[PDB]
Design a protein around this nucleic acid. Structure first.
Ligand SMILES: [Mg+2]
Ligand SMILES: [Mg+2]
Ligand SMILES: [Mg+2]
Ligand SMILES: [Mg+2]
Ligand SMILES: [Mg+2]
Ligand SMILES: [Mg+2]
Ligand SMILES: [Mg+2]
Ligand SMILES: [Mg+2]
Ligand SMILES: [Mg+2]
Ligand SMILES: [Mg+2]
Ligand SMILES: [Mg+2]
Ligand SMILES: [Mg+2]
Ligand SMILES: [Mg+2]
Ligand SMILES: [Mg+2]
Ligand SMILES: [Mg+2]
Ligand SMILES: [Mg+2]
Ligand SMILES: [Mg+2]
Ligand SMILES: [Mg+2]
Ligand SMILES: [Mg+2]
Ligand SMILES: [Mg+2]
Ligand SMILES: [Mg+2]
Ligand SMILES: [Mg+2]
Ligand SMILES: [Mg+2]
Ligand SMILES: [Mg+2]
Ligand SMILES: [Mg+2]
Ligand SMILES: [Mg+2]
Ligand SMILES: [Mg+2]
Lengths: 65, 102, 61, 89
RNA sequence: UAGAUAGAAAAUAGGUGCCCGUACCGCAAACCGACACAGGUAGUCAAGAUGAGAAUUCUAAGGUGAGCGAGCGAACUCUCGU
RNA sequence: UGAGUAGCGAAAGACGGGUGAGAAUCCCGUCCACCGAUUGACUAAGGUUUCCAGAGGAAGGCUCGUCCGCUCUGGGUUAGUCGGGUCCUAAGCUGAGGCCGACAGGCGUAGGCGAUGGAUAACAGGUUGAUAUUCCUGUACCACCUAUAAUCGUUUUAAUCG
RNA sequence: GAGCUGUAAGUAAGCUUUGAUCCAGAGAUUUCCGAAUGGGGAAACCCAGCAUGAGUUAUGUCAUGUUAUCGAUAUGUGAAUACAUAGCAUAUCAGAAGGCACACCCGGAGAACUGAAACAUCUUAGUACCCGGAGGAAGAGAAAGAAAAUUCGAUUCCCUUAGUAGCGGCGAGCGAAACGGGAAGAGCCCAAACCAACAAGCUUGCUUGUUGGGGUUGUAGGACACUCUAUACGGAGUUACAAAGGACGACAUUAGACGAAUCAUCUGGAAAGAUGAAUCAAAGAAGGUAAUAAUCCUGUAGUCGAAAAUGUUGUCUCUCUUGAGUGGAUCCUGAGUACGACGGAGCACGUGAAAUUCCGUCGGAAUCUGGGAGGACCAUCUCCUAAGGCUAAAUACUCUCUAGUGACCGAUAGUGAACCAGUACCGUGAGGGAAAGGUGAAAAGCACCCCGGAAGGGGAGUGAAAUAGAACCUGAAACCGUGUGCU
């Protein structure tokens, strides 16, 4: 998810999105070990989204202070 | 590189000097480009390789960007490239004619 | 790490000279004497040189 | 942190034999304790864990070309389930 | 005992119990001696016949045939018997 | 060069059957021999994957090699109770304040740290190619928690903690 | 501005003109150890308290924050011991710590081999080493100066003076300064007299302590008395001279953009070469491109550009602030100081005739009719005005950055290190410390066939070349073979 879309999400929405995205990553990691994952590039995309989600959230907290 | 993929360029240097062809691909880091029908190389291919058939394969190999020269649209002759900003946008201009290359 | 509280007088280094002018490093120490004096309005025992004590510059408690 | 605690599943001959006995082997974070692993497995897989046995593996030297180096240290947890089952696949 | 404070519990049932080490060699080809080196390396266990005995000779449990061989059976050197 | 010379590091092997491009040297079998207060079984140091399976034969192996502590690939170490820590202390070390000393720093009190000693609850059997008082089975023990508690107490207390 | 997912190939899955990768400015995140700081510890680990939160029937478990020491400032308690002082407890602090640039500076402490053809004074040398404190520079600095002119006017640094004057077992050797020529320049603030306020001793005498004002010197100056001048008019400033700010502009740095002019032929694998004919130049620096290119590419001259951050600077703003005379009655002008003796040290100067200046010990002035210096000392004369501070520049150095340069090296050289090097290796440790570059223009890196278990090779093919086939440019000698003419 691009930062612009993430910026639209409310703090609560971001928090929930991070959790859901983290779960997706865990599933992907388990699939890869079992050899069930073909789309390897998916893993990277999820990671950067979670990083973005975290970045946008951090900006808000700094802004509040 | 002044030369871009899909340009029609004359070869001004090498064995293939005096041949005009489209640019199939460009390698920015090596400053080399591939032009159709230029610098054809015969490569030994194993049938042991993933491709079932094994034989000598003829494909174009990269040539230095300096060796190729863009062709002026008006004259169909080798021209250098000049850049002129139009409506805040840089446009490729042939030195020979002064027309837009593309 | 021993010096007069009042003057800051401390040991110095120099040479001990023989008649043949042979030299050996030596020290001159201050005549420091431990005396009770008033420090920060409270009686305290500190090392003070006799020179400082002379003329009652330093009160002794 | 449950997703962070359990890094990946472990599939080996000895692991597969354990699975028949209802023991599931996982690679976990080196810092985590066995109790953390128990809670983590229970949350993710919604199963009841009978016990967790944990081991540490030392870094093993691996050579490629002239380059000499060690593999990452591993902490492996074997989790026995009293109730329920985990499907890794 | 000084102190502290309404609660304490024989039992019974249910539950909770972390980290580190754990492979393998370890009188040795894996340790200390540059070596797959006749050297050094704490401790524990240690059967039978013989015997005072953990000596001695031959065996047990268990391990081992030693990481160059084949000939010939001179001098000479070493080790050994008369 | 010396030179195809010195050496190839204490020892008993023989044969048959395998394997393989190749076998005195690898595997298996029989016989023979050697150790046996030990060449056996543990185990602390120390080493650190040398452990197991499959594969290989360049190099390493004082010969050879189909083999290996070698090379490649994938595996293997499971603890409330075992050893150490969440216990204790010795020598020693360190040391708030403190004492001393050109500087750096030295010494030292309280207090810490520190096993080679003290305290301290699990045993038998089974199981893998590679782990076992760790897994499994059976049968235990210890500490703590929650609940229900025979009984006991119920504010100078007299149950209880200390 | 079209590719991209480092080296690092390759495979896979993807990303990107709805602007990837990439480049610069700013920001977020930033495990654990380490001053390492909750405690401990064999660094990168273990074990806790407290608060709050998560989870659990509950315990176990987990998360976040916080908890060292010393110093300073407060606050509250407070021993022997009446008062209160230790002491103790709590709170706050961008307080300190530790690191480094193997350089420069200042200071503490301080060798020896060596030289003297021995060696003790002396020399090496106040060097190396060690330790402390720094700063971007440091240190020094506005005359108790240098001198002897018609004097000069803080300090530092350069030239020169001069290998002079001197010092010296008068040996070895050590070695100025002033003047003169230059670089660079900047001056200042206190203490005291005195005045005002406050507090204490309560003569409640006016004597102390504190604050503010005042005042700052050799032409003696100041207080004091008196007379003009001025309330920031002016003047000055954060580099000293007092100390924070704001606004705007300019320039610079940290990405970039544009940027002139060549074709043909011959040889060749390839042209930049040769040959012929042209062209540009504020650009004929340089590198690359299939051989040697001003005109092919990257550039070069020239010109242009910054959202943001930083630095420098200018102008306002802001802040601060009276400046001068005359008088000679009284007062003030840095004391255990100067200075002396003794023992040392430092001065180019080795105790000497030893001025000048510091230290330890001990003794110990004067007060403007004062005091210090002019190389013992005295007189005279002359020049200064100690015992309190601050101060830019000219100077030193280079871990580093940016742009460049070399009658510097070219793989046994140049760094130890052109390469996965402070590595491999060696050592208990401190520490010592290597070797090792080159296919080709392009990987076109030898399909296929044959012998062989493989290795290796013979063909075939790629290529200008394989006698360029992988540490693959060239390929010397030693040394090892095979054949042969003569012997
Ligand atoms: Mg364990
Ligand atoms: Mg074992
Ligand atoms: Mg012994
Ligand atoms: Mg015997
Ligand atoms: Mg011989
Ligand atoms: Mg012989
Ligand atoms: Mg022999
Ligand atoms: Mg042998
Ligand atoms: Mg061999
Ligand atoms: Mg083995
Ligand atoms: Mg201390
Ligand atoms: Mg001590
Ligand atoms: Mg013990
Ligand atoms: Mg075993
Ligand atoms: Mg952009
Ligand atoms: Mg700590
Ligand atoms: Mg001499
Ligand atoms: Mg001599
Ligand atoms: Mg200075
Ligand atoms: Mg100032
Ligand atoms: Mg150009
Ligand atoms: Mg041409
Ligand atoms: Mg004297
Ligand atoms: Mg004179
Ligand atoms: Mg070199
Ligand atoms: Mg060379
Ligand atoms: Mg070298």
């Amino acid at each position: 998810m691009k930062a612009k879309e993430i910026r639209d999400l409310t703090t609560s929405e971001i928090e929930e999105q991070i959790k859901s995205s983290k779960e997706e990553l865990f599933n992907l990691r388990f699939q890869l070990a079992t050899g069930q994952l073909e789309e390897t590039a998916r893993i990277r995309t999820v990671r950067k989204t979670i990083a973005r989600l975290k970045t946008v959230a951090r900006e808000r907290e700094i802004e509040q202070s | 590189m002044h030369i871009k993929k899909g340009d029609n360029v004359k070869v001004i240097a090498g064995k293939d000097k005096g041949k005009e062809g489209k640019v199939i691909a460009t390698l920015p880091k090596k400053d080399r480009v591939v032009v159709e029908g230029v610098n054809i190389m015969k490569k030994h291919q194993k049938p042991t390789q993933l491709n079932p058939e094994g034989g000598i394969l003829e494909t174009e190999a990269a040539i230095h960007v300096s060796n190729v020269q863009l062709l002026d649209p008006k004259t169909n002759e080798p021209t250098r490239v000049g850049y002129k900003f139009v409506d805040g946008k840089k446009v490729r201009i042939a030195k020979k004619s002064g027309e837009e290359i593309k | 790490g021993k010096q007069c509280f009042v003057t800051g007088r401390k040991a110095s280094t120099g040479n001990r000279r023989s008649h043949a002018l042979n030299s050996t490093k030596r020290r001159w120490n201050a005549n420091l004497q431990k005396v009770r004096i008033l420090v920060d309005g409270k009686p305290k025992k500190v090392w003070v040189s006799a020179r400082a004590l002379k003329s009652g510059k330093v009160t002794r408690v | 942190e449950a997703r962070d605690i359990l890094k990946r599943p472990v599939i080996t001959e000895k692991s597969s034999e354990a699975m028949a006995e209802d023991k599931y082997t996982f690679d976990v974070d080196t810092r985590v304790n066995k109790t953390q692993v128990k809670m983590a497995v229970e949350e993710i897989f919604n199963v009841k864990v009978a016990s967790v046995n944990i081991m540490n593996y030392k870094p093993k030297k691996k050579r490629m070309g002239r380059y000499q180096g060690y593999t990452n240290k591993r902490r492996k947890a074997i989790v026995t389930l009293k109730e329920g089952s985990i499907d890794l696949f």
